Amino acid sequence: TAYRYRTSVPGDAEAIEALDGSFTTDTVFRVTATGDGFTLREVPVDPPLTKVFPDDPDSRTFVAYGDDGDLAGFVVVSYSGWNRRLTVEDIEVAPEHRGHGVGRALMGLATEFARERGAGHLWLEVTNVNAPAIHAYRRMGFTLCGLDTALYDGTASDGEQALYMSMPCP
């Protein structure tokens, strides 16, 4: 569907680094600590929030290239045998390529690798302010499996919470 896919090579390092993982959102998932647990609620934000990030057999990176020779996206995966978890360390699609099936195809490639390793599930972390990726993950078969409100304390993302999502591996 207009893209080429392969395992990354050292020469992809620059394009991976340069790829624009930034996004603008009209909503965020507000995380509330209730004492007994946590609640998430999608809330509107005005003005829209623009988030800019200042970014071996069990590990793998898959890249997606467009017709133009430009990197459309990548996914970095890591496998842990103790809990048979394939961690999606990072997944990013160039803003122009968003909503063109790149993310879904890369996640499918991540799923195939998980199956090869005999994974029981796929797992990912996503900032609570990334409402579009959260909704996109939900529509790829993932559901909220946890969170860490302290993950970003003392970082450039202080005030955000890490949200955890998982999918059983077919």
Amino acid in the structure at residue 105: A
| Burial class, 16, CB count within 10 angstroms (exposed 0-12 / middle 13-18 / buried 19+) | middle
Binding part of the chain for its own copies, among 13-21, 63-71, 128-136, 148-156 by CB under 8 A, reads: 148-156
> How many CA atoms, within 13 angstroms, populate the side-chain half-sphere of residue 119?
25
Per-residue binder mask for its own copies (CB under 8 A), 67-96, x = binder: ---------------xxxx-----------
Q: Report if residue 147 touches its own copies, rule: CB under 8 A.
A: yes
Given 10, 11, 37, 57, the residue binding its own copies (CB under 8 A): 37
Least distance CB 73 / its own copies (angstroms)? 24
Please pick, from the candidates 41, 56, 57, 68, the single residue that binds its own copies as defined by CB under 8 A: 41
CA 149 to chain centre: 17
Cis peptide before 47 (omega within 30 of 0): yes
Is residue 151 close enough to count as binding its own copies by CB under 8 A? Answer: yes
- The burial class, CB within 10 Å (0-12 / 13-18 / 19+), for 74 is buried
The CB-of-142 to its own copies minimum distance in angstroms stands at: 10
The residue to which tokens 């680094």 are assigned: 17
Binding residue for its own copies (CB under 8 A) from 50, 58, 155, 170? 155
Decide the pairing of beta strands 71-80 and 85-93: antiparallel
Interaction between residue 148 and its own copies (CB under 8 A): yes
CA atoms lying within 13 Å on the CB side of residue 46: 1
Residue 15 or residue 40: which is nearer to its own copies going by CB? Answer: 40
For its own copies, the binding residues (CB under 8 A) are 32-34, 36-41, 82-85, 120-121, 123, 144-155, 161-162, 164, 166
